Amino acid sequence: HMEGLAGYVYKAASEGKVLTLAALLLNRSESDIRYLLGYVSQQGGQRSTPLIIAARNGHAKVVRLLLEHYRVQTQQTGTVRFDGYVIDGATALWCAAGAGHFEVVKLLVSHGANVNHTTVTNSTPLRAACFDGRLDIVKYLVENNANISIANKYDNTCLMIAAYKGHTDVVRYLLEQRADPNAKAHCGATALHFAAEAGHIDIVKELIKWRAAIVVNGHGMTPLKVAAESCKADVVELLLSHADCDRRSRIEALELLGASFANDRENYDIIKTYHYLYLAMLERFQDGILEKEVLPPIHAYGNRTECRNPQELESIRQDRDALHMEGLIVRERILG
Amino acid sequence: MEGLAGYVYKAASEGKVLTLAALLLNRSESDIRYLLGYVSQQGGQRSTPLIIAARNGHAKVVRLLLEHYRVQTQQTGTVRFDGYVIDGATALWCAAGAGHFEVVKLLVSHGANVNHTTVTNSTPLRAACFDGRLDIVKYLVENNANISIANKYDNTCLMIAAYKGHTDVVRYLLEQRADPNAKAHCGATALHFAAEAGHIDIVKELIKWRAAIVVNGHGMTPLKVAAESCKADVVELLLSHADCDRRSRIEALELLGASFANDRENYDIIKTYHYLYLAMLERFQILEKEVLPPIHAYGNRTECRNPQELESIRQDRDALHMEGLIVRERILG
């Protein structure tokens, strides 16, 4: 009937042929013009409206024709796809931000757009632009009354996703706008925990100098311990040069960091394991003396027991197999 | 003192056979049994002249040290390979390790023990499998090196080659009856090593040669180890055989998809859902699942127990990563 025409207006919008879009919509009743601009055509795992697809693909001319000459609500939600990650309940603003379509962000926001739109997971345009990495958009959004405080259904601040993806500049920016770095998440992790495991030493720098607290996650691990389990030596080194619980927890990191340099088969080093392990054993016995309760010998680790004194560690130096078995026997005790 | 044994050493290490033949000529018989039997300590290593020469492929020195100066092959020493410090290594072991097939032939042709045991029981054949030079491995076997000799923890020559990914020598070993159902102290077989790595061509040979599916000391099949290590190729190749009707199949599929979100080196949440939904589709074809309690670490979320539940989180980046650890925390521990 007329449904086919709406598929034709979708094409012109999605593809960006403003010339075609005009020829389709002109000489039509306002009632019909709304049905055409507001029919959820589904293509390529993406349920969207002409405006939403024209803003996710980034066809500013079509966006203007749909906003400056035609009246769109700038609030039509759609199920959009981003690199496999599928997002539902997103408006053209969110899709534009995620795609870094700054020109559309100007057009959309300045032509009216809830800068604090909430997807079904509460993802505000700010989160999408942070998860992307375009600082240029982020500032314009917040400087146009966006809220850096609004999180997601699991309480993930825009800072947290910025730390994860490793966008140092935008991390500093949100911190400049007083984005509290001590907000927690459902897991229990803070933005520090994220940038730590991801080896984002640049972001860990701008975090500590901004009241970044040493919180503990739901896995009983400080940001340091996460970085240790994640073979990010640089962070562990820097985090040690701070308010690190001396001994008990300081040695545990080195005992963990080295162990991680074995359990990998992709970043393994083994020599970096003996180094980080023997170093700890020395400190655990530096003066006195902080001993270790070794778990009983198990089969998976060759009915072998963890070295408990510095001399034993020096004996397995000439034993490739034992240095491997050690890294995992140490890990089992530290992590569970 | 006799730092002259130090100059004699530098010649052998550097292969300067002319300097060496000069130092050693006009030496009394007692003087040559001292100079060559001397154990110099050079850079995290301890060796005799013959040990460092065969270690370094200086066959001009090895031939002089062998043909004209009757030297014992059995001279053991403490050699080093990329941080790994091996003790009790004879010159033959050092040649097979460093891939010096010329020096290997010289040492063997002159009667060196082709079955020497390192202080930790490394056979000269193990060094060659570690190194992958099929030329040496084939040569050592034809001169009666025993394939059965494994190290202090029963690491077959077939295993270390299956681990290091030398398909060409793995084939050769099993061609020489090398047992594919070996088993180490850690309970692993040669199949577990090849499955952890992405070594499909080796895993192919092992199941060509009817490798047995065993459970290592850690409660893992080669299928589970592969899925635990995000080696989906090996998982699907292995699943083209016999596994516990649904139960083991689903387990690997569940664990494989969960590891894709975990593995920060191969992150693919699209692949995670694909393998996780396929399990719930192969479950509810009934094999229900015993979900573990909601834990703070995982946002006090509970594992999806029905296909509809999984379908609900597909447009939810966060819950997909969270589900991953939740699935591993159950399947592995």
Ligand SMILES: O=C(O)c1cccc(N2CCCC2=O)c1
């Ligand atoms: O046989 C072993 O236990 C063993 C242990 C450590 C290193 C090595 N090798 C020999 C060849 C190259 C290399 O790293 C062998």
